[PDB]
Amino acid sequence: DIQMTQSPSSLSASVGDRVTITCRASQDVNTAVAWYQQKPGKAPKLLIYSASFLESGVPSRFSGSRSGTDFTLTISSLQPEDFATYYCQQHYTTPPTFGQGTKVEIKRTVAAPSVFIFPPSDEQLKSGTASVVCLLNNFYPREAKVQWKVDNALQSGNSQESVTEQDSKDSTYSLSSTLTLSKADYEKHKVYACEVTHQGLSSPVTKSFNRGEC
């Protein structure tokens, strides 16, 4: 097959910026390259066919190009709604192949997470499990460090994190770490704390509580 390699793999760019994504074909694929946009939980949509022609109804700010075996999508002025994963494709040979994608996110000013910790529900606890949950709400940049400490002893691999896609109103993200244990282990410790560390966070915040249906 023909390998389409795309770079970068992801990029933050502020609004108004010129962005540039490149795909490099594995062989001369001539001009059989189309570029697709894919907005989260939605089908691909054509932006450009045969290297450089725009699809009807796509904004003038996207353009594509060919130089030898390198193909470029450029968005001259990134709008905040171009948040997406752009994919290139060669249709020169069967199979059609696709680049592995470039997730374009919007850069914005560092916001701190508000931190909420939530003890387990009694109904959960009956089923012999306790899922402690730590919420880090509306922050940026995406990276944050959530460490769990049960009675000061810092926990390993019982924690799982999940992150919201970037909000489109304010470009921030949210995140939940879930510590899940047995109600037998949940009930032999007392303080359940969630230590959060972020860039807009001066000092590591600590959200905690003391165990029980007290």
Binding site: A43, P44, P95
Partner: protein, 223 residues
């Protein structure tokens, strides 16, 4: 308008067969090459098969020839993908797409997709648990509350708050596959602490696969 709709996906056991369908509106499938493109969860777009309905020629990706069959019925203007010897790697969302033809040999019309999840595991509906405020200390400014939607199979689940009225600062996270092969998610919302107790908060969890539809009212506690 030109559209394309597919249907027929679902939970299927390994080694079974599935027939997905793709119906074209606004254009005769005769004139075009129709493709089936999948995307596994989280991964890239992979091409599966092409057919030209007129002379009926087909072409397959190697991971799929033999076991899959793409066909079309031009009088029913519909197209089909017979999938056999299904593997867990066939869990993906399947879209059909039209290669343009007339000036633009790229894929311009794409369907919405249909999820095929290939697993031995049984449909299980969610346990919905509250994530109550006031964990040790009560009241302040903005307070957060929510629902933990635990242990369900397959995907999706949908979570609405107060039967679609509370839409604000509502964060329904991504589902996580647990060690168990069961998913979990949480939907959280941030509200005034003044409203806590003047107001009720219910989350409406629907799991169309197991026909579960739970409502759980989240109200405050003290320790």
């Amino acid at each position: 308008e030109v559209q394309l709709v597919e249907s027929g996906g679902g939970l299927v056991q390994p080694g079974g067969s599935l027939r997905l369908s793709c119906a074209a509106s606004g254009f005769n499938i005769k004139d075009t090459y129709i493709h089936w493109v999948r995307q596994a969860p989280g991964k890239g777009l992979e091409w599966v098969a092409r057919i030209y309905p007129t002379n009926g020629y087909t072409r397959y990706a190697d991971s799929v020839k033999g076991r899959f069959t793409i066909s079309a019925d031009t009088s029913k203007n519909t197209l089909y993908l017979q999938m056999n010897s299904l593997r867990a790697e066939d869990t993906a969302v399947y879209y059909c797409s039209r290669w343009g033809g007339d000036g633009f040999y790229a894929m311009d019309v794409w369907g919405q997709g249909t999820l095929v999840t290939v697993s031995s595991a049984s449909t299980k509906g969610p346990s919905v648990f509250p994530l109550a405020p006031s964990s040790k200390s009560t009241s302040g400014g903005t307070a957060a509350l929510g629902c933990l939607v635990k242990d369900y199979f397959p995907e999706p689940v949908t979570v609405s708050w107060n039967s679609g009225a509370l839409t604000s600062g509502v964060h329904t996270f991504p589902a996580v596959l647990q060690s168990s092969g069961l998913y979990s998610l949480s939907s959280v919302v941030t509200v005034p602490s003044s409203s806590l107790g003047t107001q009720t908060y219910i989350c409406n969890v629907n799991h169309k696969p197991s026909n579960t539809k739970v409502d759980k009212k989240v109200e405050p506690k003290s320790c």
